[PDB]
């Protein structure tokens, strides 16, 4: 079975056949409903888990992304998501096909493109295929998701069991606080996605906090998410896939024996997983 | 199947040979030779116990 | 029982230990509520139970059955039940 | 000897609620005899089970 | 060969048992001169390389070490590596093999080794036997070895520049700190053990910048190197045959539901470990 929202895509006409599909972690089941394939084509993000032992072979796991941005890039450079407001100039919809459009004012509400685009396809053949059906089907699914979800998961959290502050434990890093105030404007959905892709810098276990890291790698936005450290020069990206410059100042050694000599050794990870918030659970 | 043998890497013993050799005095009286014929006959016998 | 007392038998099984099927049960068995370790060695427990929301009792088990940390101690019972399990553990 | 006989044997098969003890006791079995054939130590395919035949018609 | 500094320690004794493990890192040969079991017998520590990465194929990783201090751990318990003034009470000599007491005293040059060990042994019948001879030589091999390691003079080994440097701006920002007076009182094999193990936060490329973590991983004390960080709690610390009786029920004869470990497993999964960073680094043409 497949879920992957991108997977439901369909063609109301004959030419484009989005011959690039999703990713097999669409047959997967993580509740992000997003081929990895697609997270990457829209986002720059890669997800990873964390294993957790509970002094035991037992285990609570979690899932975090790592971002994809280097360390040159600058503004709507470093913007991962949106707002609302900027959606639009952030994306350039009409590049993307209307499938693509409609399903992104599906996400922001946006009645007045829902009414224009139905009131272009009213003339057409897909229309008279009712094709639109399609639309419906996914919406469908959309809205059940979003009645076991924006009412709920957060909304469901609102009991006691359970608390995310994503606000910055540093009072100093103004930057916060303000944005965790206005995670509530965002659809419960985007909520989900992003609380279940973002590591907790602590959580609360009443039995003992843990602190995860040392210091948050990323930071609330005032329009949507933006791949940037709180404070300082952005550290290294791991990046990877004119007559321009390449310039690296190479150190001199020639060895390479010592390569071979230490390829046994912890060979450190360069990622850039994302750390932020306070977490809570009740027990 | 009524059980799951773990099957890995196992085999038993023990190694108190002062013990062993205790035992081995306590076992010892006991003419084995002649008795254990009745064993014998008893698996025997329940060869045709086994059906009737 | 936890108080209550039995009437209308007219007969009894003599209890042998045989009858106490030891579960082996699966590796993970969590438990909640207080409970009493009867033997840490032949996994043996006594839980707090009421049936019918209003008939207290005690459940001896013998199995996985493990529980929340907060294992309580045998001493602080009453000592009705505490004399019945001192014959029903008959260790002799 | 060693596997906590809180029980003669007679009591374990004249008792059927278990399966648990009687396996072990017949994979012991197996094990002492295949050692005795052969003066080193074994372990085979990791994969065995048992089943009882607890009625006539089996 | 052999090169672990520790590999060498054997001692008189009716002892036919001697026990040193040492890895096959003696037989490497990347300037730690000690084996990871030692590393771990009284360190805590594990040797790492940091992949350094480069567009070009000449990647030129770098070593790294990380500990394995656990976070219940207060104190001198957390103190990874005493100062002069603190070792000794933090080891039991006593315990320690004599010779292994005499190699610490050594590498921290004081002079009380030779004030205490090298008298005390005349009553021994080892002292008195040839195998004085076999101590003292290996006595003049380790010394040996500590003056390859030593940088100090042009008379040596080591020659021309030095570019590290540690105790980087503190959040609150107290004044300087006396880390350098340590690090230069620490005999100089300890300063290279230092550089094999602590990355810095930034590296000041000559005429460019990188940086690599958002804070400090460690900080030091005058008694000796602290696994501990300036500000809020302790880090979680990462965790670390015969026949028996546990022999398991029958169970359903299925796999069941593994999709969401499954597709965890497919994920990457994170390297929960502790890199050592503490202080900055500068290069220049
Ligand atoms: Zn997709
Ligand atoms: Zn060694």
New binding site residues.
Partial sequence: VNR????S?VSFDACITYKS???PD?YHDDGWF??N??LI?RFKMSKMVLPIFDEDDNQFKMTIARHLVGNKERGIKRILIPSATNYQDVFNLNSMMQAEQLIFHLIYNNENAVNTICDNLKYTEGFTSNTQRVIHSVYATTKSILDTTNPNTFCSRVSRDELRFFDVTNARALRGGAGDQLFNNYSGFLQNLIRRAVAPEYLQIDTEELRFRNCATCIIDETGLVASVPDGPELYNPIRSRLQIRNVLKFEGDTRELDRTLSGYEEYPTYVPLFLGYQIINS | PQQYINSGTEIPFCDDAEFLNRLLKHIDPYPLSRMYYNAANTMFYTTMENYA | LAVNRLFGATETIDFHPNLLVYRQSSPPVRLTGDVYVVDKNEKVFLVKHVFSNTVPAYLLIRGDYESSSDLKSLRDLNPWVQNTLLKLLIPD | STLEMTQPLLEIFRNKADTRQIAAVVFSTLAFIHNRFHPLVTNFTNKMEFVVTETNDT
């Fill in positions: 992957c929202i991108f997977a895509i599909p999703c990713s669409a997003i081929c394939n697609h084509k």
